[PDB]
Design a protein around this ligand. Sequence first.
Ligand SMILES: N#Cc1c(N)n[nH]c1-c1ccc2c(Cl)cn(Cc3cccnc3)c2c1
Ligand SMILES: N#Cc1c(N)n[nH]c1-c1ccc2c(Cl)cn(Cc3cccnc3)c2c1
Lengths: 201, 213
Amino acid sequence: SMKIDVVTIFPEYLQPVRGLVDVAVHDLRRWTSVDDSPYGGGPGMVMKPTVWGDALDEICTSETLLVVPTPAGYPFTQETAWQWSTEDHLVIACGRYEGIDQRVADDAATRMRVREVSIGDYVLNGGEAAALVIIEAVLRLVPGVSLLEGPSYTRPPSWRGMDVPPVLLSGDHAKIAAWRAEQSRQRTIERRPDLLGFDSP
Amino acid sequence: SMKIDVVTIFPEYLQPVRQSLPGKAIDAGLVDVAVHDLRRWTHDVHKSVDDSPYGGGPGMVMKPTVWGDALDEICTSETLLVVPTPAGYPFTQETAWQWSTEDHLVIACGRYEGIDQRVADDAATRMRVREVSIGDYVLNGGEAAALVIIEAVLRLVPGVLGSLLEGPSYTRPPSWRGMDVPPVLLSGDHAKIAAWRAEQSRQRTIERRPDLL
Ligand SMILES: N#Cc1c(N)n[nH]c1-c1ccc2c(Cl)cn(Cc3cccnc3)c2c1
Ligand SMILES: N#Cc1c(N)n[nH]c1-c1ccc2c(Cl)cn(Cc3cccnc3)c2c1
């Protein structure tokens, strides 16, 4: 059983989320201008801590795992997803602009567990798409719901003059298992050599 | 000026992308994102998109004949075909920069155990195909990855959407719940501020992403 609360100034972006789990989306502006120029200078705007503090006060408890997407976060991995899959309560704080005043996470950490995470090494305009990814990766692991996958095939056995690998039609479990291992190994070496402890291209 | 076509059995999942697009960019003809229901290209009254995996195993595999027809209609020789997959090459910021100058992206979103490999292999004989993963976690299908790719790519297209880690940011008020903004930021010593931010970045990268060093 899990409850997920998502806080965002763009609640409409979280629509694609639509009994063991409830997901609720909250408009941050309900607790109010949410942004201002950064202290110390720099381009863009920073979300003010005041509005966030009030929102999180209401939504979070000491048992909450507060998730804060950020391009500067610890990596969110499958291990993270497994870890979070047994939590009772995730709150995902989605910001925009140049980010959220750091004191929001710092203040929250005095009261609950806080995880600043990034879903990958690319830049988004805000946390919402990251929230969608995190929710999907976590929810599919909730109780009651290494190497790269090799290629998959289905009918027909010949299509546009391209044949399904004959071993897959042979019914030889051992040969099929071995061919699939080899395919995964070749794929991992080519595409993700880091997973096998080699240099990245 | 970019056209993105997304093909999916859950077109409603992609609706927020068309929400995030500013009218000015669309009206200036800088961007067009169209979403297509894969079932438009099914052959049978049951609108089947999947079938059992050759060689056995759990789950199902998306049918090559359905995808083949969809991509035949939507793609041209100039298309960059993007296929999200947990077995893909990593999608990075460098990838996003590269793709941001493309005329036509087609994103093929699958489900279940994947799309019959012959779809991408056949497509690759007449267009550029890119199998990519957005990170080291497992999703149920390509749709959430497509959302991420679209956003990361389009924000690099001039006026469409509107290394070390970045350190912390602060704004008003100067004191909040017992926490003061670091005084250096209010010092007016901008060389010192830059050095402070550099050191914050270094420390954060060591703590959170040692792999980057
Ligand atoms: N998780 C993740 C993640 C990812 N993997 N990329 N971008 C994001 C993400 C997460 C949270 C925010 C917030 Cl709050 C504002 N922005 C825009 C921004 C901020 C600083 C520098 N550049 C862009 C966010 C980007
Ligand atoms: N991009 C990315 C990405 C990512 N970073 N995680 N998962 C995905 C993703 C992309 C595409 C598909 C398709 Cl098609 C089916 N599935 C579910 C699946 C397949 C094989 C093994 N397990 C789950 C997909 C998962």
